[PDB]
Symmetry: C2
Subunit: 443 residues, 2 copies
């Protein structure tokens, strides 16, 4: 088509997309239609002459919508990794219409500047800033896997220069075999991957009761490993674990890493966004010790998933995505972004409130952010049983996890549209099905 | 923001995009801005309260628009890695709203691959409509698709020699594996070889830059006689350098009787086989094991579009199939064929201006959409020309080396290149040519 054809249909699509996102409350979260349903609803060959815009859209409703998940719904109570906000859409449209540094000066320079905005919001210490401070600085990365690996490698080269200056006899090959990296037991798998690819030994540190790495567990490991003749050169401290909202004590672990020449990489994951809010910055005291810091701004700052921000204490050791950041940050503002996260933590506690009040359910981990780790008091069996009925119903979606030897339900409030109305309706549904589940147990 | 806000600014953005696209002739193809122009124009911190959409777009015009390469420009006469049409834009808006990475994903894929298969008049072997084993999938890029092929081949050959000799270890077999491609073949092949950890050898092309039966078999014998093991082989229709075509009918029977996986890469020109005039160049696919090309290049799908069929599926992220569906229904087979033919035509228009002129020469046969031309004389003269051109900033070309000869390429692959753009450009070449000829005299 030509341009002013596109003015019309584009403006129509805006409308279709608007309505979907308004009435999405009514859609069923999981597709209630079976593999193979689609072939016989559509012509076996392409049309010769163009179909109308009018007829295509209707097919979108009638043929496409039934066969789609609709993750964007308030009742999808898990993290939706490819979610996008409205500003992110607006940007996407433009980012598409445009399509190295020398290729795109703006794309590159915007990245550096947005990194600084992000920086300040989180109030990282000043060394981290790209603001021509000439020390530290940050970068966007494809994944939080990339990021962990980058710091790992940087960590490894560093230790080999320092150990080989020490004794010019030792080979790089001899050193590498002794290298050990650490992470909590609730470490993201992206740590294992990193260490695997970087060719070193990865060991878990036992988490404390609240699933935080607590130094005594770290120090022992250190002692056990320095004494078997291994070498510790790197470690991931996770803030906001993906299992639950667990936070590694940075204030105890940091000081140790400094003293033992262990590179400190802080994986804040998703939770990191929450440090734009003062109530949470205390979970981030200790960053002073870290050598790198990485988080995904997608879940709470509404930015494109494509983007994983990472900073470093020294720059020497180390798609048009900055445009969306720019839009989203500009269109919500820090306060809006703040109000956004805050609105979710409050629904998250609201839900916790509901679970405490019922004596058949327990809470497993202190509820700090959006997610609530709960379960039905009794066997893992009972609970496996219960998750099954919820998904079988196709009214809400929940994912589980295991803490220790315990099966857990994760209720996570991340969607842009969620209200306490939905949380209420979600609880009660869970409530009812738990009654039916409970009957069955006794048989 | 909220829904109804999207409504207002969603529409304004529609407009903004229209204008840009309408007034794209006015832009300069490559941004001309100094290192570090942006920062001073952006504030030091994020705003505390929301800015205005008015102020945001204004800043796109002022701050962003000078610092971007305008790839859509009809004057950007190189291959643009993103072909963006208007229906493609519309599916993006919907894929936006129904996040994807669901029975409708997998199924609309299978069906559009059958659609595209039927348009390319592929053997039924490669279609799943018949209920045959053959079927198609959509990949990220050709470089991925080529890798997915190679691996599938390495697996196959491994499971096959180990079936005949259980004492043989994967390790020992890999050491001897050999894959091949034309000496015009896209790097995406060398890269795949490094990841796949097999040896890669190049087959010498002919007068027309085509891989032929003689050279290929020469190579295999050489390498079999070394005790190496051929397993994979890449045939290229529409090469990167000059748009040449490996001889598929010659080469396909060889691979079969040599028990070699035949992957047929047509990344660029694959789209034109939906025209009956060009389908012959795809003859021999019958012999292939996997065929691949990029429609996002020339059929007006958005960039993350790749397509690859295999005869055997058991040999083998985004909602890409909704963008194809949209494009196809909005253009219809006719309209697409038309789009392809228009390019070819202005390609041939440019060819005959250059022949019309006695100071130039054509280097390779002008099959479809790319023209490889040259100022008569020394490479040196020709490097000057591209240096004017590229300096001028009026139009932009990417050259290449065909064997020894320096060659200027001229791609017509833009949604809105018209007959006029081709003449305004050729005038601008001749001007600069006469100059470079004047400096040759001194
Ligand atoms: Cl989180």
């Amino acid at each position: 088509m030509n341009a002013s054809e596109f003015r019309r249909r584009g403006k129509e699509m805006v409308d279709y997309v608007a309505n979907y996102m308004e009435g999405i409350e009514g859609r069923q979260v999981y597709p209630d239609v079976e593999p193979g349903y689609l072939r016989p609803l559509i012509p076996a060959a392409a049309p010769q002459e163009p179909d109308t815009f009018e007829d295509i859209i209707n097919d979108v409703e009638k043929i496409i919508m039934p066969g789609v998940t609709h993750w964007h719904s308030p009742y999808f109570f898990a993290y939706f990794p490819t979610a996008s906000s409205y500003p992110a859409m607006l940007a996407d449209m433009l980012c598409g219409a445009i399509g190295s540094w020398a290729a795109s000066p703006a794309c590159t320079e915007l990245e550096t500047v947005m990194m600084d905005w992000l920086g300040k919001m989180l109030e990282l210490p000043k060394a981290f800033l790209n603001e021509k401070a000439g020390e530290g600085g940050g970068v966007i990365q494809g994944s939080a896997s990339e990021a962990t690996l980058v710091a790992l490698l940087a960590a490894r080269t560093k230790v080999i220069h320092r150990l080989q200056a020490a004794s010019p006899e030792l080979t790089q090959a001899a050193i590498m075999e002794k290298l050990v990296a650490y992470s909590s037991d609730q470490a993201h798998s992206s740590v294992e991957r990193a260490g695997l690819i970087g060719g070193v030994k990865l060991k878990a540190i036992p988490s404390d009761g609240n699933f935080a790495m607590r130094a005594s567990a770290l120090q022992e490991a250190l002692e056990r490993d320095k004494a078997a003749g291994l070498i510790p050169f790197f470690m991931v401290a996770t803030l906001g674990t993906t299992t639950c909202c667990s936070f590694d004590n940075l204030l105890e672990v940091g000081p140790i890493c400094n003293k033992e020449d262990i590179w400190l990489h802080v994986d804040a994951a998703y939770a990191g966004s929450a440090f734009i809010c003062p109530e949470f910055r205390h979970l981030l005291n200790g960053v002073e010790f870290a050598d790198s810091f990485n988080f995904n701004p997608h879940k709470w700052l509404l930015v494109n998933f494509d983007c994983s921000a990472m900073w470093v204490k020294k720059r020497t050791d180390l798609r048009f995505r900055s445009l969306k950041m720019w839009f989203v940050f500009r269109m919500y503002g820090v306060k809006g972004l703040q109000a956004y996260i805050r609105k979710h933590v409050q629904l998250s506690h609201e839900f916790e409130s509901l679970v405490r009040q019922d004596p058949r359910f327990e809470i497993c981990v202190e509820v700090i952010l959006g997610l609530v780790c709960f379960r039905l008091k009794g066997s893992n069996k009972v609970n496996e049983a219960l998750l099954q009925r919820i998904n079988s119903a196709k009214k809400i979606h929940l994912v589980p996890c295991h803490l220790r030897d315990k099966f857990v339900l994760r209720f996570a409030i991340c969607s842009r549209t969620v209200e306490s109305a939905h949380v209420q309706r979600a609880w009660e549904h869970i409530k009812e099905l738990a009654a039916d589940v409970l009957r069955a147990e006794r048989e």
